[PDB]
């Protein structure tokens, strides 16, 4: 089996920038080459066949260099949609082989979040549970602590948070924190707190409400 | 144009056996021979094997030989690929692609397979409304949770795919239950919280789930002054 190996996991990179993705294989694969660019929740789309020759739709700053063993995908004037996954492959002989993937990380100035809190909806409430969403939106870069307070006690153990991939326009991370509590346990407290730090704060930014009160 | 049309996310027992489907469109089916390609954890890319759609001479990669089996419909221009003893690491994402000379140069939207013995829940659907707590000046956040669904995934859409900007749609939580729960949001000039309607489309395919939420304002108490 022929191993292609992507020595990088993560290449970051600014917007009008060049970048080289590395891929390293085992063997002479004598040029036999594809890029394959996946942007979050799609399928693979290829770049480039046989080392250097662009596929249709394909802009003309994605450039594809190499010969025997080590082979370049080159994004001349980097944009931000080109955030993705690229992986290598050998198409020389079988079993063909892809390399490990390359996330390319593009750079942008610091952005703070929006923080938005969003209660239980009344209906919910009546099913037995209360889901307390917080939303941080459009945000760079991605490290954020995001601590749940109810009434001005540290909260721990019973919050979830997910975070979306850079968005193709602004380069920037959202998150959502969602604080689960049974329906019995969130009517004893009043003051529930989203309390966010970031970089691109002075100071961490609390978002707040009175339970059932405006 | 051309497109790869596959068959929808499986939710499968262990020890039985899937088949997945891949129509080719848009092009002569029989002019190219078919892939598949398995993307498991996150990253993995396993080539599975080819099947030439003009012979039906299929040849596969040693670490599938047994479990892989390829067939050929030139008929329905479709592809077919069979995944016997499932356990569950066959849960992963199978793409087909077609081979366009020594290139995989289209692929498909991919086809979700899960491993599991429990039976699909379709998901609860609750409003995330808006209000002052979710104003920042000029744009309201508002949005949609959607909670205690089995298995992945869910797809949400505002308006009926008519709100795109601004809208988010985070990766699915699993709660202590076993079951998923996502949230997606968007982001929305307040001037128009009142005069426009906004609804999430919410389609859990495996449950066969399809709920249209109305998310309105919440019910409130103001300040007294
Ligand atoms: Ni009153």
């Known amino acids: 089996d022929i191993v292609m190996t992507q020595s990088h996991k993560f290449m970051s990179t600014s917007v009008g920038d060049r970048v080289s993705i590395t891929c390293k294989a085992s063997?002479?694969?004598?040029?036999?080459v594809a890029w394959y660019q996946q942007k979050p929740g799609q399928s693979p789309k290829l770049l480039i066949y046989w080392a250097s020759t662009r596929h249709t739709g394909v802009p003309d700053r994605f450039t594809g260099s190499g010969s025997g063993t080590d082979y370049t995908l080159t994004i001349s004037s980097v944009q931000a949609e080109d955030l993705a996954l690229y992986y290598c492959q050998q198409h020389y002989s079988t079993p063909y082989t892809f390399g490990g993937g390359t996330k390319l990380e593009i750079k942008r100035t610091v952005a703070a979040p929006s923080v938005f809190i969003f209660p239980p909806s009344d209906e919910q409430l009546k099913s037995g549970t209360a889901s307390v969403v917080c939303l941080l939106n459009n945000f760079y870069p991605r490290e954020a602590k995001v601590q749940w307070k109810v009434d001005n006690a540290l909260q721990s153990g019973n919050s979830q948070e997910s975070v979306t991939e850079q968005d193709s326009k602004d380069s920037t991370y959202s998150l959502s924190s969602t604080l689960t509590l049974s329906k019995a346990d969130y009517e004893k407290h009043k003051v529930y707190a989203c309390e966010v730090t970031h970089q691109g704060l002075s100071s961490p930014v609390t978002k707040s409400f009175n339970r059932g009160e405006c | 144009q051309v497109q790869l049309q596959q068959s929808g996310a499986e939710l499968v027992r262990p020890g039985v056996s899937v088949r997945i489907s891949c129509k080719g469109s848009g092009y002569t089916f029989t002019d190219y021979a078919m892939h598949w390609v398995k993307q498991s954890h996150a990253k993995s890319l396993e080539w599975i094997g080819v099947?030439?759609?003009?012979?039906?001479?299929?040849r596969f990669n040693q670490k599938f030989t047994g479990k892989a089996t390829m067939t050929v419909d030139k008929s329905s221009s479709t592809a077919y690929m069979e995944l016997a003893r499932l356990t569950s690491e066959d849960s992963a994402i199978y793409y087909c692609?077609?081979?366009?000379?020594?290139?995989?140069?289209?692929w498909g939207q991919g086809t979700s397979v899960t491993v599991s013995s429990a039976s699909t829940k379709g998901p609860s659907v609750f409003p995330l409304a808006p209000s002052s707590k979710s104003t920042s000046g000029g744009t309201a956040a508002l949005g949609c949770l959607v909670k205690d669904y089995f298995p992945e995934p869910v797809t949400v859409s505002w308006n009926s795919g008519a709100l795109t900007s601004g809208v988010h749609t985070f990766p699915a939580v699993l709660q202590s239950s076993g079951l998923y729960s996502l949230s997606s949001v968007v982001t929305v000039p307040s001037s128009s919280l009142g005069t426009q309607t906004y609804i999430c489309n919410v389609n859990h395919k495996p449950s066969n789930t399809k709920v249209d939420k109305k998310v309105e304002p919440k019910s409130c108490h103001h300040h007294h002054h």
């Open positions: 692609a077609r081979e366009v000379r020594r290139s995989m140069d289209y």
């Open positions: 063997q002479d694969v004598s040029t036999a």
């Open positions: 099947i030439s759609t003009y012979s039906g001479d299929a």
